[PDB]
Amino acid sequence: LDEYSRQRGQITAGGQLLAYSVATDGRFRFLRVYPNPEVYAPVTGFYSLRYSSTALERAEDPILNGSDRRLRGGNVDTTINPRIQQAGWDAMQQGCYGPCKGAVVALEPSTGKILALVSSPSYDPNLLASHNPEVQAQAWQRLGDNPASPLTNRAISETYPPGSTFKVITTAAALAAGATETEQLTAAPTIPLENYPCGDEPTVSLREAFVKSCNTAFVQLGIRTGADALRSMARAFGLDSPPRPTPLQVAESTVGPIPDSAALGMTSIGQKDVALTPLANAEIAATIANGGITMRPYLVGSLKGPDLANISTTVGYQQRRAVSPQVAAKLTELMVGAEKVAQQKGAIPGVQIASKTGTAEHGTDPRHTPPHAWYIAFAPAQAPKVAVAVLVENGADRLSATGGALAAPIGRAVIEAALQ
Template sequence: MNAPLRRVAISVLVLFTLLILNINYIQVVRSDELRDDRRNTRVLADEYSRERGSIVVDGQPIALSVPTDDRLKYLRQYPQGPLYAPVTGYYSVIYGATRMEQEANELLAGTDDRLFVRRISDLFTGRDPSGGDVVLTLDPAVQQAAMAGLEGQVGAVVALDPTTGAVLGLASTPTYDPNLLAGHDLDAVRDAADLLEAADPDPRTNQAIDERYSPGSIFKVIVAAAALEEGYTPETVVPAPRILQLPGTTTDLENFNGSACSESGEQPLIDALTISCNTAFAQLGIDLGEDAVRDMAEAFGIDGEGFSIPLEVEGSTVGDIENDAELGVSSIGQQDVQVTPMQAAMIAAAVANDGVLMKPYLVDQLLAPDLTVIDETDPEVFAEPVSEAIADQLTEMMASVVANGSGRAARISGVQVAGKTGTAENAGPDHNWFIGFAPADEPRIAVAVFVRNGGGTGGDVSAPIARRVIEAYLDGQEG
């Protein structure tokens, strides 16, 4: 073979080698990326050629697929769209899947490995393939009460079963109608998405798990726990001056509206929590030291690390503390302390459950298309931040907040409620918080209510919403 032919042969061989490598790269390395690309019309046609499984609450589908007469054979529908949108998300021809539609996509689409036998059976029997169902832990009455209570506000409600971690309510406002994003009229879908994107905040943001805020005085439960861990009791007398000059500064820290917590300038710890005395808890945090406060916060899960329920939850954090002045401000839930409403509910749930924090979970069961159970969630311990004895003391103190102090608006006739209010300063009107649980002696529900820039106090804005949510759940349990 002469030299020119040899060069041509080598060139052809190199080109064939590159072609084979490229084909393998596309089919192996980029296969998932290309399959998930919403511009891939073959994948879209395949997805919409089979019935997608349902997302179910209390036996009723809150997301389901119905047959159509157009090119895409099934249409995703959300019968109570805005009520459950913070949980379901949407399944869109253009924008893909979000929230539970995304997290459970393989099961819903029927491609989950656990449905392999079913797919083989479909192939041989000629049966139309379909996806499995996802059964959630949500309680409809809790979700409805939470969303109704937040109407017209930017905020969130999280309700947990403190003994298992099951998420009973996950509400976020403003909300939206996922049906508008799931339609087959692509121009209408794009118009709906543009309107949502232009809104402030975007209603597709889940305020309960995506965002974190200054917790204000609900963080005093953490500081109280740290004090009890160090040997304090609810009756231990602590300094509670009308004004506290922060160490190393000329800055004065005051109580709400500049009031005095006591005539003597000191009071029992339980009274300081009951009326939410800022100066008492700022000084208490300084006296305990940063390590004690931070360690207790981290024990409750405020460690900067996110987690999954399986929706992803943003991590909560104490933030940086450079000196005692910043420690004092952090101890009343300001400075750089930032928590999600989910994390706030977890604080209440841990106290309610004798100091044992259960891992929150949103999915109860996964069902095959024939409704047989293929998986279910077993409750799992997340952390054990305090002992049962300390949890009992915190319960006593939080019950006093509702019975005698800033949380009176959460009181329920015939039911002892334990809770803590929070009013957090920020660039705009104050944020308003309430965390609590009931019944205090045998807790069945723990809640956190957050209203962004509510402008009032946690006691007058968030506590009444918490009361409605707790009542809705307890009434349903009795029924």
């Protein structure tokens, strides 16, 4: 009653409103409005009479409700670029011959700004902001009963096997330990794991292995490098360390225990117990993009008073160096190569993309369930302004070179929108 008699502040992105409150005739005076609701639900969350709040409505509640000591409520200016967020959303609604389930994350590699945070399917927070008790309850019930779980922010709260994309870490680990790009790895269809034969020869170079679908090559490389170095590289890239708030909580990514050489073989190709959020996979891309330095991801650019006087501006900071500049340059070359080999649906004229596309088996029967499709990338490869990760749940195809090809045009449309 009291809370709703004051005008809750706004959540914005790029001068656009993501959430605001309007003075109405309701017993509770102010109605929360979400003008592009499904698109921005992972960022705004909801603010509900009956069901409380989520995401930024919850995380910035003191600022928005006016009670924050630093302080009409205050406003929250996000780092979201609306043109990028919209392109991610649109591509995810069209990219699976219809709507995809999964996530898109876009990061600015030099700063750590979160440029897009997309989850699909999504939901309309206006349903929960309704002042009708019954409209709220019915919506809560329908969302909770939906097997696709539209309430889940898949970008940050859910982890998935990274599969093929984890070869970026396996490679970093090997290169840091003195492996060369001409070093020979097996091209056999099976290794005592299967390829999704790597080539017409018994062995290929590391480069050629990286650009193609050669699980067996990477099993061997991972095993050759060993568990000590693989774990240590995974940690360098943020895995198995509790992530910092964005201010939204991010689920912890992990490499798993790795009990034996068999598990090491499996881990090296992003299976076994390796599990990453889409944000963590985008951070890996952004780290490589940024010459080996991981910047801390953040979603709130600044906080403002009711008068739009600035209360706080987020400082960007260097979390950690994951790899030397030299190793980051080598990974970049390899990823430019992997993008070049791919069929060029959604290619941007005059823009060089560095990427890694692939699949990840999952579930209690990974050999029969459709694997996930992943695309992680950054661009322009030689002076990067954007890093992306695309996860399409069960999106792997049985025809493309990598099996992950459906995720790639989604990633490219996001990059296109970022560079415009």
